Write a protein that binds this ligand. Sequence first.
Ligand code: CA
Ligand code: CA
Ligand code: CA
Ligand code: CA
Lengths: 15, 139
Amino acid sequence: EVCAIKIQRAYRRHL
Amino acid sequence: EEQIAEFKEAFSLFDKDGDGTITTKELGTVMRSLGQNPTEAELQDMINEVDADGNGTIDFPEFLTMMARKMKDTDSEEEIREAFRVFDKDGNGYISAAELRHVMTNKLTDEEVDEMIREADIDGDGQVNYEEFVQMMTA
Ligand SMILES: [Ca+2]
Ligand SMILES: [Ca+2]
Ligand SMILES: [Ca+2]
Ligand SMILES: [Ca+2]
């Protein structure tokens, strides 16, 4: 679930 | 990249006499211009940390290696700090169960998110601070 956080962060960063 | 050019400039600010090496005494000079006042032992430690070949001075390759690692580590810190700010909706410096829950759906129960907090909550205040967040994200 920290993995899910790492992944979605990687995709939705610098908005 | 073309960031080598920028690293050469930074190096040249340390290499006051332009001999292609940074000595403890040159480092000393730099740090006092930034308003620090390190000891000779502190200066030696900083040189030793960067001095890959152990010759007692820092050449541009040694400096470049150090700068590239510092930049990666700086980039990482900033990425984790940004993530932390996204969670910390109210900007209070702690992530609550309520903030983690909000974020985590975008579907967990109060109990499930309390569990997540506790796992990360080294200091037991029932919130996650930045230091706890870094621990959880980097372990
Ligand atoms: Ca020099
Ligand atoms: Ca050296
Ligand atoms: Ca908060
Ligand atoms: Ca805590």
